[PDB]
UniProtKB/Swiss-Prot annotation, chain B:
Present with 12000 molecules/cell in log phase SD medium. This is Probable proteasome subunit alpha type-7. GO terms for molecular function: mRNA binding. The keyword Ribonucleoprotein does not apply. Disulfide bonds: none annotated. Transmembrane segments: none annotated. It comes from the Eukaryota. GO terms for cellular component: nucleus; proteasome complex; proteasome core complex, alpha-subunit complex; proteasome storage granule. The chain holds residues 6 to 248 of 288 of the full protein. The lineage of its organism: Eukaryota, Fungi, Dikarya, Ascomycota, Saccharomycotina. GO terms for biological process: proteasomal ubiquitin-independent protein catabolic process; proteasome-mediated ubiquitin-dependent protein catabolic process. Belongs to the peptidase T1A family.
Curated annotation (Swiss-Prot), chain D:
The side chain of Thr-1 acts as a nucleophile, and the N-terminal amino group acts as a proton acceptor. Keywords: Cytoplasm, Hydrolase, Nucleus, Protease, Proteasome, Threonine protease, Zymogen. The active site is at T1 (nucleophile). Its main location: cytoplasm. It comes from Saccharomyces cerevisiae (strain ATCC 204508 / S288c) (Baker's yeast). CDD domains: proteasome_beta_type_7. The 26S proteasome consists of a 20S proteasome core and two 19S regulatory subunits. The 20S proteasome core is composed of 28 subunits that are arranged in four stacked rings, resulting in a barrel-shaped structure. The two end rings are each formed by seven alpha subunits, and the two central rings are each formed by seven beta subunits. The catalytic chamber with the active sites is on the inside of the barrel. One of its GO terms (cellular component) is proteasome complex. The keyword Cytoplasm applies. It is found in: Cytoplasm; Nucleus. PROSITE patterns: PROTEASOME_BETA_1 (PS00854), PROTEASOME_BETA_2 (PS51476). InterPro entries: Ntn_hydrolases_N, Pept_T1A_subB, Proteasome_bsu_C, Proteasome_bsu_CS, Proteasome_sua/b, Proteasome_suB-type. This is Proteasome subunit beta type-2. It catalyses: Cleavage of peptide bonds with very broad specificity.
UniProtKB/Swiss-Prot annotation, chain F:
CDD domains: proteasome_alpha_type_4. Belongs to the peptidase T1A family. The keyword Glycoprotein does not apply. PROSITE patterns: PROTEASOME_ALPHA_1, PROTEASOME_ALPHA_2. The 26S proteasome consists of a 20S proteasome core and two 19S regulatory subunits. The 20S proteasome core is composed of 28 subunits that are arranged in four stacked rings, resulting in a barrel-shaped structure. The two end rings are each formed by seven alpha subunits, and the two central rings are each formed by seven beta subunits. The catalytic chamber with the active sites is on the inside of the barrel. It comes from the Eukaryota. It holds the Pfam family Proteasome_A_N. It comes from Saccharomyces cerevisiae (strain ATCC 204508 / S288c) (Baker's yeast). One of its GO terms (biological process) is proteasome core complex assembly. It is found in: Cytoplasm; Nucleus. The lineage of its organism: Eukaryota, Fungi, Dikarya, Ascomycota, Saccharomycotina. GO terms for cellular component: cytosol; nucleus; proteasome complex; proteasome core complex, alpha-subunit complex; proteasome storage granule. This is Proteasome subunit alpha type-3.
Curated annotation (Swiss-Prot), chain I:
SMART domains: Proteasome_A_N. It is found in: Cytoplasm; Nucleus. The modification Phosphoserine is found at S227. PANTHER family: PROTEASOME SUBUNIT ALPHA/BETA (PTHR11599). Keywords: Acetylation, Cytoplasm, Isopeptide bond, Nucleus, Phosphoprotein, Proteasome, Ubl conjugation. PROSITE patterns: PROTEASOME_ALPHA_1, PROTEASOME_ALPHA_2. Belongs to the peptidase T1A family. The proteasome degrades poly-ubiquitinated proteins in the cytoplasm and in the nucleus. It is essential for the regulated turnover of proteins and for the removal of misfolded proteins. The proteasome is a multicatalytic proteinase complex that is characterized by its ability to cleave peptides with Arg, Phe, Tyr, Leu, and Glu adjacent to the leaving group at neutral or slightly basic pH. It has an ATP-dependent proteolytic activity. Present with 15200 molecules/cell in log phase SD medium. Its main location: cytoplasm. This is Proteasome subunit alpha type-1. One of its GO terms (biological process) is proteasomal ubiquitin-independent protein catabolic process.
Length: 195, 243, 231, 226, 204, 244, 250, 196, 241
């Protein structure tokens, strides 16, 4: 559970997350989905220490779902990201912090804009056109810095994402067993089943 | 009215009726006394034999605190035990911190403050006992008597319970006839007599005499129960005086 | 009257009515007898049923190998107090490798009951207890009242019509105290004592409950056909 | 940091340098190290600068409330007792090293306090990294029955020794004189022996030297009417 | 490992004639990796400006904390907080975390609305106040900034001259620091107008 | 013990009413009337100060209208001291929300929170309830302009126009008569003052006996402005509407 | 033990009255008269030193109290209740303000804190309300001079001038005729002494009257020199002699 | 530090040097290590200056409160209070205290409380870093029931040697005399005791 | 009518439990008097030992609170000792925290504050006592400060407490009306005690033996009580002129 990438194009946010889970010297699973839907138009991917990642993600999910029911209203991606950041900033000075890095990809229905937020385990939040955690950015950012436009289509974003994964697969020592790719737009969240 | 329904309420007189009602429970109890002698103190109590089935000399009433203090009380016996348990905790913490055994005046105030605290709130009931206690410390012999209000003074002789008036009169004679003082062995004899004389107020049932003493010369300043020959000698002296 | 609303209130004559009302619950309870010699101590209890389909309410509770009691009044209060005695007996054994003296057990029960008579919110215990035991000073019998008063006796009885058994034991005092080294005869004296408190009903096989403890006898309870011998 | 305290005829004087440092870098060249606990009780602090300021303010606040409660002017022994018990409780973790001085109805007083909560009495004291340089001067020139003028001179000379010889100390000398039956006189920058010389060159730039991408007015005003 | 240099960044403030200036770089990084070139480190509450360097999560947390507190202040006091008062509030708030501190280097800048007096102040991570007349510096290139400010600064500079001085102090300091740069902002603050200028600089 | 002196503030009557809530509402019925009117382009808050004095410093005085944040204000009817306790709690809640989500708190969420605090005092704790009724005037980007009221029971409801305090029966009838949905702020200002002028127990309605506030998008472009009226400004609007 | 009175002792009656607050106001009515007058360049607060015995030293009993260097207080009603409120008010000025902002609170906010404490004694468990009404005079930079009244309920109101206690109704009428927005501090003191004479039966002099002002900064009362911005307290208690001097020009 | 207390015919005398060090720097050369906890009950302090001052202040408080309730405390009682604080907080304290006092009933008494918080009643006691060098001298020269003048000489000579060899000890020799006659302070300067 | 049982306001704005606590104050039927000299403060109180079985040495209403502060109490002995213990604890704590001896007036204020709390909090009853604190304060000199169940306190030139307080008060008032000073102009405390006893004799109209009185004296740095023989010497001097 180490690779997560995100890219915000014209009308959508695309999140790509690796499928591998390793216990010791053995790869236990090659189809793991490192993501949770927080609301119909907000998706969060995650990576960090074993256990903490899913526990934190599900805890956030429960809280946003609770808010949605109470107010009969979907929080904006910005509001959700701020809530998540505070929880991590809270957590870093706890007895045992939650070692979890996240990307939040959401489509704001009010502003009609896609939004990508990158938050690390310290509670360091930034809004970006594209982002990553760990070492993923070391391999991929030079390609994204070169090819990225803000007026890219979803299809062009997927093609640039394929190039990023290919570079990861070439130069990265670990085998991460490919990625699951999900798109967040005005119509909601869907998974690209062939990548 | 209604001032007597709740503890710690001042009546228009400035009285705490609940404490005064606790005194009634004390006045209902058996007679207990204390006598201050030349180098110590003597305690004695009337134990009513309600039935033949009571095992003689087993239901002990006088209680020791630390190793140098004796305590006896009249009224609600459980309340007295509760007070002595506290007294024992107070004496232990004093000795723990200061090393020396608790002085009698110091011990008297510890009991006094605790009993007084049970007159401050409506969530507790006052103590239904008057406690006579004392012993020997570094400054000599001390005898005290403590009431339900928390009030206590030092005494030459003390008495409480149903036959307190009779006992007091007897104690007053001893004070007048012995300004130089009374010996420990004499005080034991006199204590037996006074309980026997005070038993006229409880003449329906027969009773059992119980005596204890702390004396610098006779008990090395430690609290001990009067047993065997010395107890019988005191009983004989007492029986001779009533006839 | 105006002074019986709670345990924290003395009456004008210095009485505690809630404690007296708790004492009344014991008088409504079924009769139980206690007596001892110099070698053994015995409990005899008349158990009470709800109706003919029901069981007979147990009256005797074991506290340790050398100690136990019988109850009269609120049974759940006896369970609380007997549980406390079990713990205290057990604390003495585990910490000091020492069997708890019966006299000390009585002092502990007195103090526990007393706290419920001086504080607001609580209530007095609504049960009376007869504690028998054999310790380093021989056989013992104690009577517990929820006022806090605990008394060591040769023999006694508590519950409804207990006065009849108590008078009998007061007559028989010189006889039953001398029954040393004969458990069956001591029990007989107890069964004869409790018989002085019966009216209309008699001692049957599921009605009678007996317990005994002594010199070389652990605290054991007899019920059912084990007491037919004494009927 | 160099701080000293000196007793004299009818009172006490304290003094300090004005350099605060973060490692080898000078953070502030004119720092104020003479703190007021109460009008006539002043203290100077060495060690962790935030701790010396915080502990002085806290005890100063409680001293003020105590003074109002008792209808009496605050005493130096009270400030001392409150400071030491606070510092002792925190077992040296509050890194405050103070010289406390003042006048009160009892007289004039001078004490030092360690961070772990130990205190000392003396006629002359010094604390901080330059305390050895200062104490050398004090041990050479101190005498009994000093006048006000002699004490101020001795105190400032002791700080100067720290300024010139200790790298942890520098810039200016601050002084506060507390005399019996008088207002305490705080003499900020009593000596100024370290003014920077004029530079060889002016480094004022021509306007338009810096490249600019965007300009905009920042709205600092509240939401407007109409 | 060192929390005060993980993310990098710098802030500098200066006083001039009837004006103050405060400036900062725009970089946020994860040690060697540059993450954001739009991470502004200067915030304002009414007319009082606060720059914060150090650990980025604490920068964001403290901004939110001081917005929180200055908003309550305003509702109760019925007036905007002044630079002198806010400085004490920052100090108090930092010291309350004495043994678990925010890893930051805050810098206050502003003009008192009643006296018209220019004001700047700096703090260490635990609350100690540095109230300099001339300039305050903070961040991973504070040594560099001290060097620039000490030589470039002169008192009583006019607003547009102060802009050039503080800009050149920031830029050249940042270009000698690996963890600072990636853009820069300068605020020029007068009693009732504030101008914000983004500077062009090298992007390495 | 202590039970003897317990009034038992959180019990039902045989009819299923909460004694203390009902009696608190009786208290509030003697408080100065406060009115809220919602228009398409803003909200008006108008309230009557209780029998004042000439020596009262009006320009620094506040007993009726309070600011919770930049978007939300309240009008008070009842015990002023009780209100300030709740007002400060609401101010904190608004800032807690803003810190957490980085967005201004929606009006209803603030109202529900305060109303829940009132509710708690009626169900547990054995304490007397807050003798306060609020009118909430606020704006957010979900529902726009909103009026709410809450009372000591902790029940709250939404309104186009509403009154609390004294003579609410008379006031509500007058508002129900003249209120229309397409009404504007300037019209609502007039309606509020006219209603107070007719319902007041005083001889005449003057500037020194009033507190007034508006919430307008009459702030330069897409944003909202709160205006707590000054004594001279209340005097001017009284002349403009033709009451003095 | 334990405080088992966890329920309110002040409750609404069927008519909507809070009895204990009304009764606390009645206790205030029985109290000795105290007043306050605000001038353009200051505020004055005054009261009678009703000595319980001539053997008592009435100088040791301070009815007018310094809360901060720029804020003072006086009362009518129960003296002991006032004394403990002054202790709490002095402390809260530090704990909830000075230790946070490094400066003393403005008058209105300190009043607000005192009011809150008095409100809580009206709702919290097992307590009665305070049996005092306070008059708090003060100055701060941005609000200028101010005068506030605080009642047992916790309600507070700002005044140009007012009176509380025994003869407050007559005194307030007297103040309405004399007050204007152009009064100088010495004029306000003169009016205060005139007003206070009406409610006093016996001796009327500097030893039986207690009077303080919030006015100009007093650098002579600061206790130290050297800091220009620190100019001294605005609160000053007038001496017995200073009062008598103004009673000759009465 | 060099401290000692010595019982004699008329009572007890406490003795001490005046040097406090931070490493090799003498932070105070005129320290008063003889500390009053009650009128005629004093103590000599060694170890952490912070700890021993804190302890002594607490003891002074306890004995002041004791006196208000129960009258003058015995020296044994004072030693017991010292011990309770030192024993129960042994993990967090570095304190070596000698307690000395005069009763009329008991006369002069000396109690030493070393690091662990144990108590030892002795005719005389020595403690502090400098005491190591005078175990031989003090054992050979101490007699019971000495005169005031003899006891002063014994302490003066003993602490002189402790000062001579121990770098952590020095300055003036302070002494406090506890008898029926009252409390007397003595001081002896280097020029006096160095030539002994 | 539960407003009379606990410390809440009656319709008249009164606290009846406080008023009834004042009445308990006179339950002992003892009168006390306090006066100030030049260098001292003297307090005298009647001593009545009605029972022959009592140890008269233990019968006392004068307390040594600290080395400098003395306290005489008017009221029942249980509440008196309650107040005495608390005052001793407060005085000792003060010295530990603030590094100097607690002043007489500061202790009086503290005990007065504690008493105020009992008049406001329902669960605590007032103590039925009046406390007269005496000392020679290092700043204020000879000091008399008295506290009551209402939580009221004030300093005094002289004062009297008990059933016949008015007679003693007027007697003292008349003397100070003559002398026109705030104290007894006398060098020795012995003569100040003689003044105090003489004026109590005049005011009450009763003669005293050595066992009928109890005397406390405050001087600089100590407060002490006189023995019966010390009082006898005082009574002899009074009779011989
Ligand atoms: Cl207090
Ligand atoms: Mg990040
Ligand atoms: Mg330590
Ligand atoms: Mg760079
Ligand atoms: Mg680069
Ligand atoms: Mg040496
Ligand atoms: Mg009360």
């Amino acid at each position: 559970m180490d690779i997560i990438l995100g890219i915000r194009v014209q009308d959508s946010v695309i999140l790509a997350s690796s499928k591998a889970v390793t216990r010791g010297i053995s790869v236990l699973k090659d189809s793991d989905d490192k993501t949770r839907q927080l609301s119909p138009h907000t998706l969060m991917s995650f990576a960090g220490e074993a256990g903490d990642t899913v526990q934190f993600a599900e805890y956030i999910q429960a809280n946003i779902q609770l808010y949605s029911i109470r107010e009969d209203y979907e929080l904006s991606p910005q509001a959700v990201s701020s809530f998540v950041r505070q929880e991590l900033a809270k957590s870093i000075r706890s007895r045992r912090p939650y070692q979890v890095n996240v990307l939040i990809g959401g489509y704001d229905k009010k502003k009609n804009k896609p939004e990508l937020y990158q938050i690390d385990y310290l509670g360091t939040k930034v809004e970006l056109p594209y982002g990553a955690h760990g070492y993923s950015g070391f391999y991929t950012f030079s390609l994204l810095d070169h090819h990225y436009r803000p007026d890219m289509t979803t299809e062009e974003g997927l093609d640039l994402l394929k190039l990023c994964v290919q570079e990861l697969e070439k130069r990265m020592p670990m085998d991460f067993k490919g990625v699951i790719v999900k798109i967040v737009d005005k119509d909601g969240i869907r998974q690209v089943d062939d990548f | 009215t209604g001032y007597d329904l709740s503890n710690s309420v001042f009546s228009p007189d400035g009285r705490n009726f609940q404490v005064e009602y606790a005194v009634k429970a004390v006045e209902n109890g058996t007679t207990s006394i204390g006598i201050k002698c030349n180098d110590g103190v003597v305690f004695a109590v009337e134990k009513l034999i309600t039935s033949k089935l009571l095992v003689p000399q087993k239901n002990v009433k006088i209680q020791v605190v630390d190793r140098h203090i004796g305590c006896v009380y009249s009224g609600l016996i459980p309340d007295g035990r509760h007070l002595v348990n506290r007294g024992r905790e107070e004496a232990a913490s004093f000795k723990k911190l200061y090393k020396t055994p608790i002085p009698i005046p110091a011990f008297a105030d510890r009991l006094g403050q605790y009993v007084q605290a049970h007159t401050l709130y409506n969530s507790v009931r006052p103590f239904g006992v008057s406690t006579i206690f004392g012993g020997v410390d570094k400054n000599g012999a001390h005898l005290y008597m403590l009431e339900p209000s928390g009030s206590y003074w030092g005494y030459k002789g003390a008495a409480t319970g149903k036959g307190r008036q009779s006992a007091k009169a007897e104690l007053e004679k001893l004070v007048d006839h012995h300004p130089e003082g009374l010996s420990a062995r004499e005080a034991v004899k006199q204590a037996a007599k006074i309980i026997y004389l005070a038993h006229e107020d409880n003449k329906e049932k027969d009773f059992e005499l119980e005596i204890s003493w702390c004396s610098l010369s006779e008990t090395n300043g430690l609290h001990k129960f009067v047993k065997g020959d010395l107890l019988q000698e005191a009983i004989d002296f007492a029986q001779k005086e009533i006839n | 009257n105006n002074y019986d609303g709670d345990t924290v209130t003395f009456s004008p004559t210095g009485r505690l009515f809630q404690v007296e009302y708790a004492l009344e619950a014991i008088k409504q309870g079924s009769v139980t007898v206690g007596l001892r010699s110099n070698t053994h101590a015995v409990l005899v209890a008349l158990k009470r049923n709800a109706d003919e389909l029901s069981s007979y309410q147990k009256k005797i509770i074991k506290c340790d190998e050398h100690m136990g009691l019988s109850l009269a009044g609120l049974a759940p209060d006896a369970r609380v107090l007997s549980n406390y005695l079990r713990q205290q007996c057990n604390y003495s054994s585990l910490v000091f490798n020492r069997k708890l003296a019966v006299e000390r057990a009585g002092h502990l029960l007195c103090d526990k009951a007393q706290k419920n008579t001086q504080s607001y919110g609580g209530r007095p215990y609504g049960v009376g207890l007869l504690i028998i035991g054999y310790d380093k000073s021989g056989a013992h019998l104690l009577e517990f009242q929820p006022s806090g008063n605990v008394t060591e006796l040769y023999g006694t009885a508590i519950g409804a019509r207990s006065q009849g058994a108590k008078t009998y034991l007061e007559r028989t005092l010189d006889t039953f105290i001398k029954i040393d080294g004969n458990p069956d005869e001591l029990i007989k004296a107890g069964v004869e004592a409790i018989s002085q408190s019966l009216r209309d009903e008699s001692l049957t096989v599921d009605n009678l409950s007996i317990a005994i403890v002594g010199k070389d006898t652990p605290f054991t309870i007899y019920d059912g056909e084990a007491v037919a011998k004494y009927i | 940091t160099t701080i000293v305290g000196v007793k004299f005829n009818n009172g006490v004087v304290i003094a300090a340098d004005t350099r605060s440092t973060q490692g080898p870098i000078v953070a502030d060249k004119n720092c104020a190290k003479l703190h007021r606990i109460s009008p006539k009780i002043w203290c100077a602090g060495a060690g962790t600068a935030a701790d010396t300021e915080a502990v002085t303010q806290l005890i100063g606040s409680n001293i003020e409330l105590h003074s109002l409660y008792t209808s009496r002017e605050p005493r130096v022994v009270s400030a001392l007792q409150m400071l030491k018990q606070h510092l002792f409780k925190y077992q040296g973790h509050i890194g405050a090293y103070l010289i406390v001085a003042g006048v009160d109805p009892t007289g004039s007083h001078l004490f030092s306090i360690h961070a772990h909560g130990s205190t000392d009495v003396g006629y002359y004291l010094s604390l901080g990294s330059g305390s050895l340089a200062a104490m050398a001067v004090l041990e050479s020139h101190w005498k009994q029955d000093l006048t006000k003028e002699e004490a101020i001179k001795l105190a400032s000379d002791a700080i100067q020794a720290g300024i010139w010889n200790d790298l942890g100390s520098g810039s200016n000398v601050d002084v506060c004189v507390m005399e019996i039956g008088k207002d305490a006189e705080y003499l900020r920058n009593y000596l100024t022996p370290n003014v920077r010389e004029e530079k060889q060159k002016s480094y004022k730039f021509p306007r338009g030297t810096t490249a600019v991408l965007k300009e905009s007015i920042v709205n600092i005003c509240d939401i407007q009417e109409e | 490992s060192d929390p005060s240099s993980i993310n990098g960044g710098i802030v500098v403030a200066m006083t001039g004639k009837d004006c103050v200036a405060i400036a900062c770089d725009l970089r946020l990084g994860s040690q060697s990796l540059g993450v954001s070139n739009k991470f502004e480190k200067i915030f304002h509450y009414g007319h009082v400006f606060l720059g914060i360097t150090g650990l980025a999560t604490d920068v964001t947390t403290l901004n939110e904390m001081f917005r929180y507190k200055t908003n309550l202040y305003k509702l109760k006091e019925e007036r905007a907080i002044e630079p002198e008062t806010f400085t004490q509030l920052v100090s108090s708030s930092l010291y309350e975390r004495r043994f678990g501190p925010y890893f930051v280097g805050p810098v206050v800048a502003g003009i008192n609305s009643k006296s018209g007096k220019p004001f700047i102040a700096g703090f260490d991570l635990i609350g100690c106040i540095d109230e300099a007349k001339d300039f305050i510096v903070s961040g991973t290139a504070s040594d560099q900034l001290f060097g620039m400010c000490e030589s470039l600064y002169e008192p009583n500079l006019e607003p547009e001259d102060l802009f050039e001085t503080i800009s050149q102090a920031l830029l050249n300091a940042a270009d000698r620091d690996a963890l600072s740069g990636w853009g820069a902002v300068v605020y020029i603050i007068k009693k009732d107008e504030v101008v914000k200028r983004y500077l062009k600089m090298r992007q390495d | 013990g202590s039970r003897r002196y317990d009034s038992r503030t959180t019990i039902f009557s045989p009819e299923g009413r909460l004694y203390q809530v009902e009696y608190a509402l009786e208290s509030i019925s003697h408080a100065g009337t406060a009115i809220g009117i919602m228009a398409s382009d803003g909200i008006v808050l108008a309230a009557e100060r209780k029998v004042t004095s000439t020596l009262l410093e009006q320009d620094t005085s506040t007993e009726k209208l309070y600011k919770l944040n930049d978007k939300i204000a309240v009008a008070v009817a009842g015990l002023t001291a009780d209100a300030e306790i709740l007002i400060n709690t609401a101010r904190i809640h608004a800032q807690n929300y803003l810190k957490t989500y980085n967005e201004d708190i929606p009006v209803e969420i603030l109202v529900r929170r305060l109303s829940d605090i009132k509710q708690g005092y009626t169900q547990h704790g054995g304490l007397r309830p807050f003798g306060v009724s609020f009118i909430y005037a606020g704006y957010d980007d979900r529902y726009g302009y909103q009026l709410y009221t809450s009372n000591p029971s902790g029940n709250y409801t939404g309104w186009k126009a509403i009154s609390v305090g004294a003579n609410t029966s008379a006031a509500q009838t007058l508002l129900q008569m003249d209120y229309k949905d397409d009404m504007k702020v300037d019209d609502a200002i007039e309606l509020a003052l006219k209603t107070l002028s007719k319902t007041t127990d005083s001889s005449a309605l003057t500037y020194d006996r009033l507190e007034f506030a508006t919430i307008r998008k009459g702030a330069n472009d897409g944003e909202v402005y709160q205006k707590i009226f000054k004594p001279q400004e209340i005097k001017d609007i009284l002349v403009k509407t033709g009451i003095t | 033990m334990t405080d088992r009175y966890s329920f309110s002792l002040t409750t609404f009656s069927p008519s909507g009255k809070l009895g204990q607050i009304d009764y606390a106001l009645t206790a205030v009515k029985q109290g000795v008269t105290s007043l306050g007058i605000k001038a353009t360049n200051g505020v004055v607060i005054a009261t009678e030193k009703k000595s319980s015995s001539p053997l008592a030293m009435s100088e040791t009993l301070s009815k007018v109290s310094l809360l901060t260097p720029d804020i003072g207080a006086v009362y009518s009603g129960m003296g002991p209740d006032y004394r403990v409120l002054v202790d709490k008010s002095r402390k809260v000025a530090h704990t909830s303000y000075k230790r946070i902002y490094g400066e003393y609170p403005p008058t209105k906010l300190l009043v607000s804190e005192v009011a809150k404490i008095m409100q809580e004694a009206t709702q919290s468990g097992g307590v009665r309300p305070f049996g005092v009404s306070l008059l708090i005079a003060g100055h701060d930079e941005f609000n200028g001079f101010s005068l506030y009244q605080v009642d047992p309920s916790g309600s507070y109101f700002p005044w140009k001038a007012t009176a509380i206690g025994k003869g407050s109704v007559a005194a307030k009428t007297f103040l309405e005729k004399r007050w204007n927005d152009e009064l100088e501090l010495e004029d306000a003191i003169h009016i205060a002494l005139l007003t206070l004479k009406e409610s006093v039966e016996g001796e009327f002099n500097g030893d039986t009257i207690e009077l303080a002002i919030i006015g100009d900064e007093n650098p002579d009362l600061l206790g130290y020199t050297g800091i220009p911005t620190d100019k001294g307290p605005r609160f000053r208690k007038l001496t017995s002699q200073e009062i008598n001097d103004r009673l000759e020009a009465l | 530090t060099s401290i000692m207390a010595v019982t004699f015919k008329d009572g007890v005398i406490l003795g001490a040097d005046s040097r406090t060090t931070t490493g090799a720097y003498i932070a105070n050369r005129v320290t008063d290590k003889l500390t009053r906890v009650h009128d005629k009950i004093w103590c000599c302090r060694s170890g952490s200056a912070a700890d021993t001052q804190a302890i002594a202040d607490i003891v002074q408080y306890h004995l002041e409160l004791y006196t208000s309730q129960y009258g003058t405390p015995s020296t044994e009682t004072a030693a017991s209070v010292f011990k309770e604080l030192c024993y129960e907080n042994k993990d967090n304290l570095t304190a070596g205290i000698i307690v000395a006092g005069y009763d009329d009933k008991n006369k002069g008494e000396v109690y030493t409380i070393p690091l662990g918080g144990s108590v030892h009643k002795l005719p005389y006691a020595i403690a502090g870093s400098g005491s190591t060098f005078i175990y031989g001298y003090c054992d050979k020269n101490f007699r019971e029931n000495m005169s005031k003048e003899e006891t002063v000489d014994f302490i003066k000579h003993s602490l002189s040697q402790a000062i001579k060899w121990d770098g952590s000890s020095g300055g003036v020799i302070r002494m406090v005399v506890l008898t029926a006659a009252g409390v007397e302070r003595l001081i002896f300067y280097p020029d006096e005791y160095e030539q002994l | 009518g539960y407003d009379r049982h606990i410390t809440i306001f009656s319709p008249e704005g009164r606290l009846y439990q406080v008023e009834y606590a004042f009445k308990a104050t006179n339950q002992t039927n003892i009168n006390s008097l306090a006066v100030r000299g030049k260098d001292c403060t003297v307090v005298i109180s009647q001593k009545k030992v009605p029972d022959k079985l009592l140890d008269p040495t233990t019968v006392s209403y004068i307390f040594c609170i600290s080395r400098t502060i003395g306290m005489v109490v008017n009221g029942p002995i249980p509440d008196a000792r309650n107040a005495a213990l608390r005052a001793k604890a407060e005085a000792a704590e003060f010295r530990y925290k603030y590094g100097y001896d607690m002043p007489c007036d500061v202790l009086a204020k503290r005990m007065a504050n504690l008493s105020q709390i009992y008049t406001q909090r329902a669960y605590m009853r007032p103590l039925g006592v009046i406390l007269t604190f005496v000392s020679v304060d290092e700043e204020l000199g000879p000091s008399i400060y008295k506290t009551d169940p209402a939580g009221y306190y004030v300093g005094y030139k002289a004062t009297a407490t008990g059933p016949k307080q008015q007679e003693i008060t007027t007697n003292l008032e008349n003397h100070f009306k003559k002398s026109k000073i705030d104290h007894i102009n006398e060098e020795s405390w012995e003569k100040v005690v003689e003044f105090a006893i003489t004026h109590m004799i005049d005011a009450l109209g009763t003669e005293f033996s050595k066992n009928d009185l109890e005397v406390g004296v405050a001087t600089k740095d100590k407060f002490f009580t006189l023995s019966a023989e010390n009082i006898e010497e005082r009574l002899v001097a009074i009779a011989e002129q």
